[PDB]
Amino acid sequence: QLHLDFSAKVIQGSLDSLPQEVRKFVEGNAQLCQPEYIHICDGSEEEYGRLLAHMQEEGVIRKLKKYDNCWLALTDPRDVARIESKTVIITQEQRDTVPIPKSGQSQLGRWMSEEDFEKAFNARFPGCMKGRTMYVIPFSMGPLGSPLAKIGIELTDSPYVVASMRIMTRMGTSVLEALGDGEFIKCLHSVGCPLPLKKPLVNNWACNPELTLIAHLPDRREIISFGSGYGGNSLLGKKCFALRIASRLAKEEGWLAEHMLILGITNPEGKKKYLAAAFPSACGKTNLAMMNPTLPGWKVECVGDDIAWMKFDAQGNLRAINPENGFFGVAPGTSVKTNPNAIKTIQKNTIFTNVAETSDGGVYWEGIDEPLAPGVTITSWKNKEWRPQDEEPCAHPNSRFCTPASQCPIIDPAWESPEGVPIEGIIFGGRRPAGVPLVYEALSWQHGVFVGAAMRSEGGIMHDPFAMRPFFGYNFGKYLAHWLSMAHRPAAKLPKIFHVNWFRKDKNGKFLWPGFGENSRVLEWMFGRIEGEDSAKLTPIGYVPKEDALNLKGLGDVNVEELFGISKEFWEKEVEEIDKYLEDQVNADLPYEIERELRALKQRISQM
Ligand SMILES: Nc1nc2c(ncn2[C@@H]2O[C@H](COP(=O)(O)OP(=O)(O)OP(=O)(O)O)[C@@H](O)[C@H]2O)c(=O)[nH]1
Ligand SMILES: O=C([O-])C(=O)[O-]
Ligand SMILES: [Mn+2]
Ligand SMILES: [Mn+2]
Ligand code: NA
Ligand code: NA
Numbered sequence: 001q002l003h004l005d006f007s008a009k010v011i012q013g014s015l016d017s018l019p020q021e022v023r024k025f026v027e028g029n030a031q032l033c034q035p036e037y038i039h040i041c042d043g044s045e046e047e048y049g050r051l052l053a054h055m056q057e058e059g060v061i062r063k064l065k066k067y068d069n070c071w072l073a074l075t076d077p078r079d080v081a082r083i084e085s086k087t088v089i090i091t092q093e094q095r096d097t098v099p100i101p102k103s104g105q106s107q108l109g110r111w112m113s114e115e116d117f118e119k120a121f122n123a124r125f126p127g128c129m130k131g132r133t134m135y136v137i138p139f140s141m142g143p144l145g146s147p148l149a150k151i152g153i154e155l156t157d158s159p160y161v162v163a164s165m166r167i168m169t170r171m172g173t174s175v176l177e178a179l180g181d182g183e184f185i186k187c188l189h190s191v192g193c194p195l196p197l198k199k200p201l202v203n204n205w206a207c208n209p210e211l212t213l214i215a216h217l218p219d220r221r222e223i224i225s226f227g228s229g230y231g232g233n234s235l236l237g238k239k240c241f242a243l244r245i246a247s248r249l250a251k252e253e254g255w256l257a258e259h260m261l262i263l264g265i266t267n268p269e270g271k272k273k274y275l276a277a278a279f280p281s282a283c284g285k286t287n288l289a290m291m292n293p294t295l296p297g298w299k300v301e302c303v304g305d306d307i308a309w310m311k312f313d314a315q316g317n318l319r320a321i322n323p324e325n326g327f328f329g330v331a332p333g334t335s336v337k338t339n340p341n342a343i344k345t346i347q348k349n350t351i352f353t354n355v356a357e358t359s360d361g362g363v364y365w366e367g368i369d370e371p372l373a374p375g376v377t378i379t380s381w382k383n384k385e386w387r388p389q390d391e392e393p394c395a396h397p398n399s400r401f402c403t404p405a406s407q408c409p410i411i412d413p414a415w416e417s418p419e420g421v422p423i424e425g426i427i428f429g430g431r432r433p434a435g436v437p438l439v440y441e442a443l444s445w446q447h448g449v450f451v452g453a454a455m456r457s458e459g460g461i462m463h464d465p466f467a468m469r470p471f472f473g474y475n476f477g478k479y480l481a482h483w484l485s486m487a488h489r490p491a492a493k494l495p496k497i498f499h500v501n502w503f504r505k506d507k508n509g510k511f512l513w514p515g516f517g518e519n520s521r522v523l524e525w526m527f528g529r530i531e532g533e534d535s536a537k538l539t540p541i542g543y544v545p546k547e548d549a550l551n552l553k554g555l556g557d558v559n560v561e562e563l564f565g566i567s568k569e570f571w572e573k574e575v576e577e578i579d580k581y582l583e584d585q586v587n588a589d590l591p592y593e594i595e596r597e598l599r600a601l602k603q604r605i606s607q608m
Helices: 020-033 045-057 114-122 159-168 173-179 237-253 285-289 340-345 445-453 476-488 516-530 560-564 568-585 592-606
Strands: 010-012 037-040 071-073 087-090 133-141 150-156 185-190 213-217 222-226 256-258 261-266 272-278 299-304 308-312 318-321 326-330 351-353 356-358 400-404 421-429 439-441 496-500 536-539 542-545
Touching (some): 020 150, 133 237, 150 173, 159 237, 159 326, 159 400, 237 476, 261 421, 272 516
Parallel strands (some): 010 037, 071 351
Antiparallel strands (some): 213 222, 326 400, 439 542
């Protein structure tokens, strides 16, 4: 050059050390964003402890004195969740990203043109890191060096993101060494608050709500996120990369990237199988992935609780890996009763966001179901004193823990095996207060994809097909076609597909099923069905357990008639509702097989 060599500003590592393409990505975005310092993360314990202690000294995080190396971050309340309306995918044509709805608004993604995004980018990123450190985070999604793993580089101006990525991905120098001159996903993040601050800082939490924009450019292998320091907006490996970018990659390359837990279940005979399950956010993946089974002699072990990458191997087994390195789990509702294994995992080396703090340096949230000693007081996530009779919760309803996977006492022994675990069943499920029984089994692969397409969240109202509504990297119609195509992969060992419903209520709004560890009784049935056991009765919706097939010992107060009932009237409405939805939201891009399954279901219900 005659006068972008950023070597003078490197305060950890060396630009000369980086693979050539990594250096180009770092230096191009350094020129653009103008950070004061560049810190190439090494992923070391030393780095991490120093970063936490720094954040602590600035008032960005607090140490939770009751626990071993745990920390609390309280955000600006404007920055507390994924913002779906500010989350977009850029492609040349809108239809490649989302189907064109008849109601002029898609529920299945949000497209932005290249032109509009270029303008948005130029209005945000120039100079956005002034006065700050640009951290360079080399990370692997999946076990380091696994043939199913994929590497990214995230640039960020947030120490909180660096700490959380260290938990949620594999990151540091070993990733750079593994990468060499290979391809990587380019991830660029800024809290959007260059120094000197143009607006006041709220709760020591840098963010720019008005300019928040989480963009995905699958054709350029780029994720570009501005304005939010929170969770799925800032930890780019998780939703942005491992669902949105990865699902489109998966479609091109013949595999699947899904919003699924992966678990290993062992029966009293010592026989083990792996299952994957897609439930929408707020519908209990993490509880099932970590289940403490109530049934004696059974064991559940966790491979992952949120994302699965699955690819058929040479023998036709559908192999799954967890591309994450930790659990970014919802804190409220987590108790010894609902998730005892999570309670164990999170007492050390854990970062909590937006939960309450007790006066002895512990954590608190709605549904923790753990009384405090008299005199122990509570500071809410809004940093105000709080009492249990107050109108507001003590913790944000989407507050999280961020905890290392390897600490889970029931972590699966194969949770990092590079070839992945063989999936034998896929479970769909949602919140259905009425009509849908506790468990049913799909009649075929094509029926099972239809059943995934029919999933619901939020009290049985919102459609959330495959638990992917906020996460599709491309047109949902085409994703259906991709799933259906698996039936035609020669010698594929197609998993059995089930649908569960933990959430059926009686007329008074009481749950008909106790759930949590009692769900082990449902898993027992699925396990027997995969083994070929004659434990199923055919019904218009699929197979259900025979009378006496489920182990209900210890649960004699269960209303079996209501929990397992199938009403013609309910199912007529359901098929009409599904028809309207698929027409409104998918229309021209709906695969014929999905249409055929809808007709087949309608026809079976007509014969009741
Ligand atoms: N009634 C009942 N509720 C359950 C069961 N399992 C989980 N839940 C509820 O599920 C909610 C917690 O699920 P989340 O951790 O939000 O769900 P998730 O699928 O892990 O979501 P993300 O982490 O956002 O993907 C709480 O309201 C729990 O009470 C069950 O067996 N029965
Ligand atoms: O953070 C999550 O896991 C989610 O929102 O599904
Ligand atoms: Mn979860
Ligand atoms: Mn999730
Ligand atoms: Na704060
Ligand atoms: Na087919």
